[PDB]
Design an enzyme around this catalytic site. Structure first.
Site, PDB file in Angstrom:
ATOM      1  N   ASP A  28       0.794  -1.241   0.000  1.00 41.76           N
ATOM      2  CA  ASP A  28       0.000   0.000   0.000  1.00 41.76           C
ATOM      3  C   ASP A  28       0.823   1.286   0.000  1.00 41.76           C
ATOM      4  O   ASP A  28       0.236   2.350  -0.196  1.00 41.76           O
ATOM      5  CB  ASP A  28      -1.087   0.030   1.107  1.00 41.76           C
ATOM      6  CG  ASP A  28      -0.522   0.107   2.526  1.00 41.76           C
ATOM      7  OD1 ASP A  28       0.649   0.465   2.710  1.00 41.76           O
ATOM      8  OD2 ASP A  28      -1.285  -0.141   3.483  1.00 41.76           O
ATOM      9  N   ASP A 138       0.082  -9.706   8.451  1.00 48.19           N
ATOM     10  CA  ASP A 138       0.043  -9.247   7.069  1.00 48.19           C
ATOM     11  C   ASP A 138       1.472  -8.855   6.697  1.00 48.19           C
ATOM     12  O   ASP A 138       2.102  -8.058   7.402  1.00 48.19           O
ATOM     13  CB  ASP A 138      -0.927  -8.073   6.967  1.00 48.19           C
ATOM     14  CG  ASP A 138      -1.490  -7.860   5.566  1.00 48.19           C
ATOM     15  OD1 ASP A 138      -1.318  -8.710   4.669  1.00 48.19           O
ATOM     16  OD2 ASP A 138      -2.153  -6.805   5.401  1.00 48.19           O
TER      17      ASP A 138
HETATM   18  O1  LIG Z   1       0.807   5.934   7.225  1.00 49.95           O
HETATM   19  C1  LIG Z   1       0.711   6.732   8.406  1.00 49.95           C
HETATM   20  C2  LIG Z   1      -0.624   6.437   9.083  1.00 49.95           C
HETATM   21  O2  LIG Z   1      -0.689   5.007   9.292  1.00 49.95           O
HETATM   22  C3  LIG Z   1      -1.941   4.603   9.836  1.00 49.95           C
HETATM   23  O3  LIG Z   1      -1.957   3.186   9.893  1.00 49.95           O
HETATM   24  C4  LIG Z   1      -2.515   2.558   8.732  1.00 49.95           C
HETATM   25  C5  LIG Z   1      -1.446   2.239   7.693  1.00 49.95           C
HETATM   26  O4  LIG Z   1      -1.062   3.447   7.003  1.00 49.95           O
HETATM   27  C6  LIG Z   1      -1.931   1.256   6.648  1.00 49.95           C
HETATM   28  O5  LIG Z   1      -0.763   0.845   5.923  1.00 49.95           O
HETATM   29  C7  LIG Z   1      -2.591   0.060   7.324  1.00 49.95           C
HETATM   30  O6  LIG Z   1      -3.210  -0.776   6.320  1.00 49.95           O
HETATM   31  O7  LIG Z   1      -3.632   0.517   8.182  1.00 49.95           O
HETATM   32  C8  LIG Z   1      -3.080   1.254   9.274  1.00 49.95           C
HETATM   33  C9  LIG Z   1      -4.186   1.437  10.328  1.00 49.95           C
HETATM   34  O8  LIG Z   1      -5.288   2.147   9.743  1.00 49.95           O
HETATM   35  C10 LIG Z   1      -2.006   5.140  11.243  1.00 49.95           C
HETATM   36  O9  LIG Z   1      -3.233   4.727  11.847  1.00 49.95           O
HETATM   37  C11 LIG Z   1      -1.981   6.653  11.189  1.00 49.95           C
HETATM   38  O10 LIG Z   1      -1.949   7.195  12.512  1.00 49.95           O
HETATM   39  C12 LIG Z   1      -0.746   7.127  10.449  1.00 49.95           C
HETATM   40  O11 LIG Z   1      -0.764   8.547  10.238  1.00 49.95           O
HETATM   41  O1  LIG Z   2      -7.145  -8.386   4.910  1.00 51.90           O
HETATM   42  C1  LIG Z   2      -5.796  -8.858   5.041  1.00 51.90           C
HETATM   43  C2  LIG Z   2      -5.008  -8.581   3.765  1.00 51.90           C
HETATM   44  O2  LIG Z   2      -5.576  -9.371   2.715  1.00 51.90           O
HETATM   45  C3  LIG Z   2      -4.770  -9.390   1.555  1.00 51.90           C
HETATM   46  O3  LIG Z   2      -5.476 -10.131   0.563  1.00 51.90           O
HETATM   47  C4  LIG Z   2      -5.424 -11.557   0.661  1.00 51.90           C
HETATM   48  C5  LIG Z   2      -6.855 -12.061   0.508  1.00 51.90           C
HETATM   49  O4  LIG Z   2      -7.637 -11.766   1.657  1.00 51.90           O
HETATM   50  C6  LIG Z   2      -6.884 -13.576   0.279  1.00 51.90           C
HETATM   51  O5  LIG Z   2      -8.204 -14.008  -0.098  1.00 51.90           O
HETATM   52  C7  LIG Z   2      -5.988 -13.974  -0.850  1.00 51.90           C
HETATM   53  O6  LIG Z   2      -5.894 -15.389  -0.962  1.00 51.90           O
HETATM   54  O7  LIG Z   2      -4.699 -13.491  -0.531  1.00 51.90           O
HETATM   55  C8  LIG Z   2      -4.579 -12.079  -0.501  1.00 51.90           C
HETATM   56  C9  LIG Z   2      -3.097 -11.769  -0.423  1.00 51.90           C
HETATM   57  O8  LIG Z   2      -2.586 -12.195   0.848  1.00 51.90           O
HETATM   58  C10 LIG Z   2      -4.597  -7.981   1.003  1.00 51.90           C
HETATM   59  O9  LIG Z   2      -3.606  -8.015  -0.037  1.00 51.90           O
HETATM   60  C11 LIG Z   2      -4.113  -7.039   2.078  1.00 51.90           C
HETATM   61  O10 LIG Z   2      -4.119  -5.698   1.545  1.00 51.90           O
HETATM   62  C12 LIG Z   2      -5.001  -7.119   3.307  1.00 51.90           C
HETATM   63  O11 LIG Z   2      -4.477  -6.281   4.333  1.00 51.90           O
END
Ligand SMILES: OC[C@H]1O[C@@H](O[C@H]2[C@H](O)[C@@H](O)[C@H](O)O[C@@H]2CO)[C@H](O)[C@@H](O)[C@@H]1O
Ligand SMILES: OC[C@H]1O[C@@H](O[C@H]2[C@H](O)[C@@H](O)[C@H](O)O[C@@H]2CO)[C@H](O)[C@@H](O)[C@@H]1O
Length: 179
Positions: A28, A138
């Site tokens: 991401d 993850d």
């Molecule tokens: O990237 C800074 C931002 O991160 C936030 O956490 C996110 C993260 O960016 C994302 O990669 C992940 O999938 O989800 C987390 C939780 O929502 C964090 O919460 C923020 O405080 C921060 O500014």
């Molecule tokens: O929600 C956790 C994580 O999931 C990731 O996708 C998985 C998906 O749930 C599963 O069905 C498939 O078999 O594999 C993918 C890849 O691991 C997704 O890429 C993440 O962004 C997310 O945080």
């Protein structure tokens, strides 16, 4: 039975008396919830996109809490060892079972990740995700570091371990170090 960790009497999947975890991979580009990038900007340090780093499910990330910034377990390291199992339709068996150490640098929130990260208590409280695991990791895959392991959502055993020296030194640059 593609999952090799069997549920105990409380529903928690274990393998020879070790707790199991599920894993996924993500990409991401965010700095992430442990502040491992320049202050004030959503830009990660390059190492936080390149190295073996993870976003665990929320209740492990914050040791029972719901903080998604500087969670209690930021900077911890975990050793993940494949069992050979996987969730059918949602992974596969890896080519080998070499263990890999990952550092916690981000969080997988319950919100939007209910299937894997929707666990309503920390490890040790017998809460599990929809596949029977007490915790989920993850794994960051921005540069294909998980692809290079040939891990397709493997089932693993998990343990906290001291971080390797290079990952410890990296973490000292994160804003959440000593927060
Ligand atoms: O990237 C800074 C931002 O991160 C936030 O956490 C996110 C993260 O960016 C994302 O990669 C992940 O999938 O989800 C987390 C939780 O929502 C964090 O919460 C923020 O405080 C921060 O500014
Ligand atoms: O929600 C956790 C994580 O999931 C990731 O996708 C998985 C998906 O749930 C599963 O069905 C498939 O078999 O594999 C993918 C890849 O691991 C997704 O890429 C993440 O962004 C997310 O945080």
């Amino acid at each position: 039975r593609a999952q090799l960790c069997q549920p105990d009497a409380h529903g928690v999947r274990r393998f020879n008396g070790r707790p199991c975890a599920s894993t996924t991979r993500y990409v991401d580009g965010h700095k992430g919830a442990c502040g491992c990038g320049q202050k004030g900007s959503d830009t990660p340090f390059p190492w936080n996109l390149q190295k073996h780093v993870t976003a665990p499910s929320e209740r492990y990330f914050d040791d029972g809490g719901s903080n998604l910034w500087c969670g209690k377990n930021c900077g911890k390291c975990v050793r993940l060892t494949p069992t050979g199992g996987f969730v059918p339709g949602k992974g596969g068996a890896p080519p080998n079972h070499n263990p890999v150490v990952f550092m916690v640098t981000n969080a997988c929130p319950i919100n939007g990740n209910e299937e894997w990260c929707g666990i309503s208590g920390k490890p040790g409280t017998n809460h599990v995700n929809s596949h029977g695991y007490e915790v989920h990791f993850d794994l960051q895959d921005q540069v294909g570091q998980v692809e290079a392991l040939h891990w397709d959502n493997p089932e693993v055993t998990w343990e906290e371990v001291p971080c390797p020296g290079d990952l410890q030194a990296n973490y000292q640059q994160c804003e959440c170090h000593n927060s």
